[PDB]
Amino acid sequence: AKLHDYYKDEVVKKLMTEFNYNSVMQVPRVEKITLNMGVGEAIADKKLLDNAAADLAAISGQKPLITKARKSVAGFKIRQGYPIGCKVTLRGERMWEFFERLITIAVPRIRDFRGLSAKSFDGRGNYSMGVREQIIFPEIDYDKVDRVRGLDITITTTAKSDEEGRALLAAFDFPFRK
Amino acid sequence: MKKDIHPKYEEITASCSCGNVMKIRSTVGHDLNLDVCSKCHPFFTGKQRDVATGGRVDRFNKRFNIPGSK
Amino acid sequence: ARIAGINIPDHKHAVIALTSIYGVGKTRSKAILAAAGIAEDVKISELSEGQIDTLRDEVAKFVVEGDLRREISMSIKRLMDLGCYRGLRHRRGLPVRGQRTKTNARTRKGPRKPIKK
RNA sequence: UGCCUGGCGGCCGUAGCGCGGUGGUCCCACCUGACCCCAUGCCGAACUCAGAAGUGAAACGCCGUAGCGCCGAUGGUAGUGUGGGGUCUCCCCAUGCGAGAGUAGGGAACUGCCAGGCAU
RNA sequence: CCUCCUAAAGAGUAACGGAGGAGCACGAAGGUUGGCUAAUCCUGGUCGGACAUCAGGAGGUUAGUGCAAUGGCAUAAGCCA
RNA sequence: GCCCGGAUAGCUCAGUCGGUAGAGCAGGGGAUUGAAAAUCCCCGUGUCCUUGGUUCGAUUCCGAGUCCGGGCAC
RNA sequence: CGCGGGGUGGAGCAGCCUGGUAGCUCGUCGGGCUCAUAACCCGAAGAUCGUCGGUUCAAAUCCGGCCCCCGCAACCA
RNA sequence: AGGGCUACACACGUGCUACAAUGGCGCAUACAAAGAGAAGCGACCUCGCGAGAGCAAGCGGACCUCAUAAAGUGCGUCGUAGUCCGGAUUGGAGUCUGCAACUCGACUCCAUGAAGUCGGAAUCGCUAGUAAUCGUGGAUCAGAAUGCCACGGUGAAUACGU
DSSP: HHHHHHHHIIIHHHHHHHHOOGGOOOOOOOEEEOOOOOOOSOOOSSSHHHHHHHHHHHHHHHHOOBBOOOOOOOOSBBBBBBOOOOOOOBBBHHHHHHHHHHHHTGGGGOOSSSSSSSOOOOSSSSSEEEOOOOOOOOOSSSOOOOOOOOOOOOOOEOOHHHHHHTTTTGGGOOOOOO | OOOTTTOOHHHHHOOOOOOOHHHTTTSSSSSSSSOOOOOTTSSSOOSOOOSSSSSSSSSSSSOOOSSSOO | OOBBBOOOOOOSHHHGGGGSSSSHHHHHHHHHHHTTOOOSSSSTTTTTTTHHHHHHHHTTTTTOOHHHHHHHHHHHHHHHOOOOOOOOHHHHOOOOOOOOOOOOTTSSSSSSSOOOO
């Protein structure tokens, strides 16, 4: 709800006024949020990636893709073509609704702030909050005494520098141990 | 947004204004602001003299008149 | 999980339940219940959210695992960076309260290793 | 008649790249919305459909700039045909052919077609 | 029996000359429509921080090619439906 | 490429005329001795190979094909 | 010359056939029994597969070079 | 005077506490012996979470004091989950004895909270007020006791036979 409505009126004027952009539309915008568990654990057992997707879906708000391996050699020699990761990808209303369940709920329910002290960005203006465990789930009876697994929160922006890019995000207010 | 990717999005959209009582808000959690150490220990606390917890009744100088007929 | 503080189970009694927080033991848990006006042997599932919040206001008053574990780290670290004898034993993984180091002490010297001959 | 924008070319780096400037109620991008036919191994990003305001920002067209890519003489040099010599593992002589590299210099494109706007 | 060199800028031509492979696979790994584009490194990244999955950038195929080498290919002869 | 004949406890075999899952030895525990070698004990496992079919029900009874082992073929 | 086999924990042997897997008996070290040693019992440790490279996602293993050990061969007038 | 014997890679003997439900936790409740004490032990009193504090009676030993006997009994509670088991560790605050508790004290409390699911080979003590188990006192001793020395509570298996 409120995030895209807030970005529209406030974050576009704020960034325009602080950075004096050449034309208003050149304010940085929010480009897709991709989430992603990655493997978690356990290639071999080959059940758990299908359980990982069914956990991830609830807080994604869409089915996970189930990414499979490229040529691979890391913590095991995965070869190529095995199932491995998870992957989501959001934009528009789905992302703006998501970005409100982040920030409002999920971040204040992380106890020690592994989710954000100081954290730094890519080479241009994209960022990646690797959350440690389990956040919140839809209506009721959230906990089923599961098997942990955090996830990458890779949020993306159209922005030209990481110094500029953190004026964005911060205009929606960003963490209390930051 | 194909039809069969089943979000729970009616529930996830629903119940949307949550209180400070109901689910804490983002108006709670910066409140204990900073991580605080004070290195001016006891005995740096202006205490150059010390005394125990309690027993503070009847304080005067009496030089060991405590035995009952020794 | 996130009941009063972030670390609590259900169907435990309220004296037991808060113990799992870190910074509230058996004595503080009793005293937190006394403070809140709550009976001890109540199932923690039984309490409603405004009662649970009343516990949560007192639970926040002390110290809890995000704040505690940073504090006890900072206390130890101040000794290790200072380099006093206390801190040196704390650095070295041998006993710091002066215990007999000749025979026992396999809490600090851990799981056994061979003679490495 | 000219200037500018778009499609299909011809030739296919002197045509490229960099760097800077610059253009938007023709037009083109981006653009918003996704209702609906349509569509995603999740994702309206892509594809597709329906369209107002917005912006020239990114893309791209245009201009300037030689930093780089690139073209490049003449002469000499190598090599070789044929015929001849000798100190013959190789080189000379006759005369036909004659590079590659490198130097001067050129260099930021020329041009046909139909299509729209603006000025004349 | 195949590929490269010797092989002399058309034919490719010997030597117990130099160097490598094949004796099959495939019912899709064939047909056709439709879409898409590589190795590698960096930077950010919840434990593979030497190497999974992710996102961003540079690069511009340095990759791919059922299997050898040579030729080949982006309109793809590659990869997917 | 035929006719044969087998495919189970881990093994060989087999209670298995269709009404119904075993002997011999293999690994663990208990019970005794200069631990042992060695007694005695209680569990050891199968949709009888994959598919057809007779039937009140049948693996085997009647059948088609894969693999092993034995003959004649070429 | 030439051809083929071999190079494993301190010892002797196994695994080596397009491959991911370290096993046995001795010896060793710690504990035990014994007056004490022997033996006997229990536990543990020990090989980055001669060496260098190559192919491979992965190599002790397959491939190539060198050193080292063995078997056979090095004639015919 | 300060340091040391009280270190640590590790190996061993001896003992404690434990791994739980015959129990741990809570609250209420029962009945001992033996001993020490004028360098000492110290009620009652009011204060302290408590260790302790101060104020102060008393005692020369059947008198006063150390000294609330514990396990047991009552009732509630927990549910085989390394836990309401276990408490090792370490932080922090605190008390006392003493010149001083850093090396090198004891104890209180708050918090935290490991190994541990009854132990391989081996192996020891005991015949009945015994073993097992529960507490109490004392010597030394300013201050350090799981040790040693003693006291009493509850109280067993079985010994055919050589």
